[PDB]
Amino acid sequence: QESVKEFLAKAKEEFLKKWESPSQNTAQLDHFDRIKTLGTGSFGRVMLVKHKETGNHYAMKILDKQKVVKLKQIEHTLNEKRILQAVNFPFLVKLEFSFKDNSNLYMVMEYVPGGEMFSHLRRIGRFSEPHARFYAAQIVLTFEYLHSLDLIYRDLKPENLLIDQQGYIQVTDFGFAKRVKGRTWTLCGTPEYLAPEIILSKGYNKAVDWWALGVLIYEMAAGYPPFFADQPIQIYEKIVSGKVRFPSHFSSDLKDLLRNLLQVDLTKRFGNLKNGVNDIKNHKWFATTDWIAIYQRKVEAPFIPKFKGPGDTSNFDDYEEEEIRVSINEKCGKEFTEF
C-alpha cells in the first residue's frame, strides 16, 4: 500500500499549489445572513452565518483591519489566511470563502457545531485517559501533517479545538501558524502552553508544538494545566524550572509520555528526535490507538455533542452582539493587498 512518506509527499504537492497561488475574494458580505456570535477574540468575532443561496450554515471570522495593524499582527494575519486556504486534513477546519471590505477581513469556515473542547473539558472536569487519548491522536496526526509542510502551529489549546458532529476534533485559529524551514523567534502563544525555549528568547522550531501537545494532554487528563498561576511571570518560572507534578490518577504510561513531551531540553523532547513523530505514535500510552482508523474517522467517539437542528448554537456561550459597520473609506488597503 501507499507509504506514509508517499502520502505526505502528495499532501505537500497539493498544499504547495495553493500556497503559491492563494485564493482571494471568493464571496462578499451580502451573500450571508449573520445570525449569532459564536466566539470573540482580540481583533473581532466569529459569527454563525447562513449562506443565502444554499442555506448552508458557516462560521464567519471577522477581523478589524485597523486593530490588526495597531496590535502589529499584519504578517501573522496574512500567514493565517494564506495557510488556512492551503491546508487539507480531516482534523483541520475547512475554509470555504474569504474576502475583505473597507473595514474588515473575513474568513468563512465550515461551522463546527459541537463547541470548544474548552467548554466540555471545564464542565466535565477532566477526560478519562481513553477520551484524552482519542483527541490527542488527532492532534498528533495533524501536527505530523502540518510539520511535513514546514508549518508550525503555535497556538494549541482547548479554546482553539472544536468538536464536530461526529465527536472528532477540528483545529481552528491559524493566527500564529507560520511556514518556516529554519528556526523562528516570535514571542507568541498562550502562557500555559509556551515551551521553555520560547520564554527564554531562543530560536525555536516545531518542537514547541510537541511541548504544547504535552500541556494539552496533561490538561485534558488532569482538568488543569501542568503550570498555572495567577501571574503569567509565575507561569513562566514554573515552565523553565523543569519540574512537573502529576495527579495520582495518571497512569504510568501517561506520565512517561508527558515527561518526554514536557522535556525542557528540546534536543531530548519526543517529536524532535531522529524518529520524529514516530517516537510519539509508538509510545506505550498510544499502544491501543489505531492510527489509520483515527485518520479514517472510523473510531467511535467518546461522546457526540447534542444537536437540536441546523444552526443550533447551544454548545457555545452567548456573547454581546455588535452590528458590523463598514466604513465608506478603505482602511489599511496596502497592508492587506494579498488577503
Binding site: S42, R122, E159, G175, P191, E192, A222, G223, Y224, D230
Partner: peptide, 18 residues
C-alpha cells in the same frame, strides 16, 4: 488539592494570547 487551587485561580476561563 491542586484542582481546588486551579478552580480558585484567575486562569480557568478562556485564555488570551501573548
Amino acid at each position: 488539592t491542586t484542582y481546588a487551587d486551579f478552580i480558585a485561580s484567575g486562569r480557568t476561563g478562556r485564555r488570551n494570547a501573548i
